[PDB]
Amino acid sequence: LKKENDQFLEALKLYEGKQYKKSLKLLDAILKKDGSHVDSLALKGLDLYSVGEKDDAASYVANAIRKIEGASASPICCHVLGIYMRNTKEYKESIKWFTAALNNGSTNKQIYRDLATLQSQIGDFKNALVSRKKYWEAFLGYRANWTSLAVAQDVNGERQQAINTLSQFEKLAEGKISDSEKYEHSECLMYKNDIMYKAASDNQDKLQNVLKHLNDIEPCVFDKFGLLERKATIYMKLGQLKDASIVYRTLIKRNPDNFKYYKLLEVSLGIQGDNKLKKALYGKLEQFYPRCEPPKFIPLTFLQDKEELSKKLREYVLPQLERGVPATFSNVKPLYQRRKSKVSPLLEKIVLDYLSGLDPTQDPIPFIWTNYYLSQHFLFLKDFPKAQEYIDAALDHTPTLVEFYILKARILKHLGLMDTAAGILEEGRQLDLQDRFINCKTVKYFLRANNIDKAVEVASLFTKNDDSVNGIKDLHLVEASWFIVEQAEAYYRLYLDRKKKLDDLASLKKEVESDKSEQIANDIKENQWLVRKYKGLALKRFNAIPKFYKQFEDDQLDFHSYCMRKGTPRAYLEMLEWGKALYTKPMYVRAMKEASKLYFQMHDDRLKRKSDSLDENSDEIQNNGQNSSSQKKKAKKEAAAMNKRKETEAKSVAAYPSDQDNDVFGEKLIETSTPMEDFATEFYNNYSMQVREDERDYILDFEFNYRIGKLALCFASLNKFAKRFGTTSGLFGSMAIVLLHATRNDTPFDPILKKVVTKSLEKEYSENFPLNEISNNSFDWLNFYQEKFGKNDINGLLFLYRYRDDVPIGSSNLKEMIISSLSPLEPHSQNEILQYYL
RNA sequence: AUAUUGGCGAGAGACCGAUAGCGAACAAGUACAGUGAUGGAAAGAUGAAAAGAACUUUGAAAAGAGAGUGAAAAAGUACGU
RNA sequence: CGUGGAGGUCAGUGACGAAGCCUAGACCGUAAGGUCGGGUCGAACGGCCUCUAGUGCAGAUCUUGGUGGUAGUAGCAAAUAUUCAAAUGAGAACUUUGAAGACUGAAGUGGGGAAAGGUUCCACGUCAACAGCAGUUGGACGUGGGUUAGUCGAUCCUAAGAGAUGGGGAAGCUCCGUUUCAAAGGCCUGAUUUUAUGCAGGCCACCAUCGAAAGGGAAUCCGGUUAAGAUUCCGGAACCUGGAUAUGGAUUCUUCACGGUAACGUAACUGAAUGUGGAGACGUCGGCGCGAGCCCUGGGAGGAGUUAUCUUUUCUUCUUAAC
RNA sequence: GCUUGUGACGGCCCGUGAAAAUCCACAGGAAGGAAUAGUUUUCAUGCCAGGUCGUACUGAUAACCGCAGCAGGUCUCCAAGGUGAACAGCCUCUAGUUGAUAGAAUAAUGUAGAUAAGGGAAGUCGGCAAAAUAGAUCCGUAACUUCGGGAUAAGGAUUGGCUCUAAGGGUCGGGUAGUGAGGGCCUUGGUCAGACGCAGCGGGCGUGCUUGUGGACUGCUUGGUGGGGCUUGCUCUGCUAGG
RNA sequence: UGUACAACGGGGUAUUGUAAGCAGUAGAGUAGCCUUGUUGUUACGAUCUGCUGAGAUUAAGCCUUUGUUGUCUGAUUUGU
Known part of the structure; x- marks a missing residue:
């Protein structure tokens, strides 16, 4: 060990700059003379990982790790290994290597800062505090410290x-x-104020000191919005009402279009009990802001007189109908969610009285806006023929509006006509090809219309087309989600339709002379193969949104240092809160539920087809053999044609690169080994470790813990659901019935868990569900359910129909009850449930 | 008043044009061969101007693949055509 | 008909490109030849009437220069001889180191030299050309350093030889001769107190020069120090020549010494011209005596090796100069 | 036992087998000289200088010459141990090399060596080429002749290894008894050059290191505070310092 | 994947010729000596005899061998 260290030191400057080939050549020349050099292998691994290679880089890194016994070597190797682990989404190993390097003897304090970032990604703050203290004591000439x-x-x-x-x-x-350091300073001041907020509590002297400090730093703090907000908060936490009212009036003068400021002023003034005071206040404030919207929308929430309410509604709808805004119904969208038989009749009467005095030629714009508002109002009131008549009259009056076509497509979708709606919306979109919202809506409605190829062809227009025939790669690079979710649902619907298709085809079973279903089977086999391939592609696309969220969380590497260098600690706390709440999005929950359903269905049908039927030799033959008719050449030609078609199909649906993911066909995802273990270690641990209290889906947790052998978690989730959302829900009764049927000794599980669950149920719920009817086969649970919770609940019936194999409570009677109970709903939902959910 | 391929200083061609013209248009009585009186050559002009190759990669290098200079490098120093 | 050049003309053409070269492209002329078109390529060139020749191509075993069949054949066969492990690297039948196995078998394939080569010896880095294969290797390449004399030679003298003046012939470049019909030169004493070294005398005639770095010859070794020089440098000890000059010894009033019969001796113990003698100075062959070196061997003091069996065992060190 | 140098020698000649420079000696007698000192530096010591040029290496199947690193030509001193008359032929030590494109089959035909049953030159222009004979001693040895030769003529007999026998030399020595020198005198006793030199209690010359104690800076389990900003957790310049 | 084959070893058989080592009052005779002898012994001593009718090879181009050790898919080319 003499010349190799010198060569490594002379080659380290190549990695320090912007050189890679010259360093790789030197590393190869060093390894050609001695292959047992740990530093050279560790550097070559990172060099190959930084240029594009992954397999060779990982192999060299694993070899370098295996060629290490104790923790006594050069710190450069440990630093390179830490950099590699940081670049390969490995934080614990990187922290360990950096700690081992710093414990040996490194004169570079900046390395400590690296730890101050690494632990900042895993939440380990106990050692992060010591690391920050050391990095601050090392350098005393930067405000970032x-x-x-x-x-x-x-x-x-x-x-x-x-x-x-x-x-x-x-x-x-x-x-x-x-000068440039002033703003940052101001920000820091605000952060200190936040710290003083943590020292506020409810003490009078502390709040007075915080208020004095804020009033003293006001001439120095540049941020005024947050300053005034904190001042108003301090005034509210004390008792001064006039000063708080003045602060809120100043905030309104700075920005009147804010519902939060108006609500805070209403709370501060203490006039929420009297209606006349608020009426006079809003009437006086309306003269100060005649072009705003909250001052005219908020007073429509505490009016009791009918004439005054009608006059206010008329004065609110007259300017919107005169100027014509594409959100008039939106302006009354939340009110309709809280009022109905008391406000909507008066609004309808006012709109009809205003329309009866208009003219289709003198005032065409108010006429068409009134027609659109009436169509919206009738669509909200579960009316469809009159809405179609109004939209047809509007199209005949002025066919140059995209909103009319959007409303027509929405009505046709609500009436179960997805294809006609997609056609009308495409025809309307072809009128002007410059807007992207209408294109996205058209793609979504085509995906909801069992039309995926046309939807992709329409979407492949505004996307960047370079190394692909379409724009799927561009849609995946712009970080999409709704498109993938809407396309995977279409794939699932098309895959479920094939089940009913095969059932209808097998119901005949070659009845008498039925050679039509026997002589024609190649097209059916090709269709089934294509459906299976698209179903696998759907599962492949499902493995993207969690990966996208993981990538978003991992991309916060340089932010830990940027928020301290630029001086944005409040932005740092906001980023921390955002990273913690990433796993609380509705789209994420929907995708996780769909993935869980798919994994459970795969587990179920795999365990069903594993040991069933008989004669495997007569079933594993498939085709590729026509006896004495050249079977070898025919099978070879068939395989060649199948490969040639699959290559073109994969190039068409190309989304992931070939060097980054080889599982393009998706055959390894649909035939995995342990699906539950993967779903728990990839999709469940994050949501379990980062979740609130009231926002928690108990149905998914119950479905996940049912088929694992742990019933204590199921009982705890059921008890929490009953304590939070009450006990008058059909889902509670359905889950209780499922648990009671699962605790039966016939089901192969754990007798101790069943016994402890039975004891817990007998101790908790003793006068709710009969726990002594598990031995009688004549007791019907459906009658008891419809007598207690009733049959009006749809979610409970859907859950009982989904979990009906383990709970024998009938089938035909349950289906008839569901069909009879689905009638007071929308036709599209009824059709979807009858086609797929039933 | 006559002679003058040697030497110095000048003006010219119906003269050959570099395998010629004096042996030599260049490091031409140079190198080289012989103990000798002596014999005695071969060798021009890349490009207007080196501005003749910064830099990347391959290769241990030589050099190649580029890039680029430059009217033009099927003008790159073994170079007018 | 074609080429070099010149006179007149076409107010000729031409880098928006000529000359030249290629053209299983065409046209004209019986033909020597000319014209256009496509590419090359870049600087000047063509027709008409005449004039001026260093004016035409296939070999003259013609000259200069370049290139094929042979042919990737012939051949890389004497001096009895190579293998294994590590290092230098992209590359160890060929380099270096280590272990062997072998040659010269000491009128050596070794140490030093006279010719002869003239920086080829040595260090660093180096493989484009040389080492008829290969090569990070070299007497190859580039950059640098390295040759110390009183004791060696040299220098000088001379033999066999060459040769210049005085002279003799040749028109002459020059030939003979060189002590031969040549009145040819330096060398010691005395003068001194203008003499500085000239002169008043005794006198000797040798007769020019060059030429044998193994002929003769005034003078030394020891040990070590350098990537190269050692008898030259370093430390010690002597010898020869030349010129200065003092000490002591010896000699003397038997002024230039005694002893031994003798051959001769004792540390010095006046002295020139001239003459004489000796050294210098010398054949080969064979033996004898002596000395030195080499070689063998004993005692004794060390070091190395054997030891299945045995050997007071086999080898090596124990040296001394010039004076 | 080998090489070299030297001295007297024996034979050789109608070859009897070199000069000069330079030094030394003798004959000779010119000239000079004494001691109150004049000579003597061919006696020993004491002073200075000896100039100029060569100096490395090769001296050869690679450094010279043969158009090239070409089994060709080039002089001189040295050189051991054993067999062996021998400076030959063979093996080895000191010393110098391992360099002369390499490997595998190893068939014709060739280069350099041989082997060859019986006959034997009959082969060929010719036994030229091969092999024989051929190392040391002995017997024997013709014709011829110029009587010196022929003559190792021809022809043959022995010739290994171990242990023994006889022979060819030198250097030494020719008495007993009384005496002197035992020119070795050992030894017992000393006389006084019995010195030079072995070793020690030692002294000086500074000085080589520590236990136990007045002190010192940098530091810690840290007890307690001049001040500032937060007007509570908290932060900073810090400070008197108990141990 | 096999009474297959290869390298060793056991033999059959052949070439040469009685080894290595020890022992023997063997050994032509010679020296040291001591109780000096009716075999006196310590060493030198070419050789002779006893195991040796073994020892050296036994295969490259001889024969066999369930013994010992193993081997058993490295690439290219082909059509009326």
């Missing part, structure tokens, strides 16, 4: 220490602040 120390002491719990540190820093640097 002070900001990082303040943030670390505020997040942990050292509030007084952070206040003292900020005070000492401001005393030492009083007057030595440049």
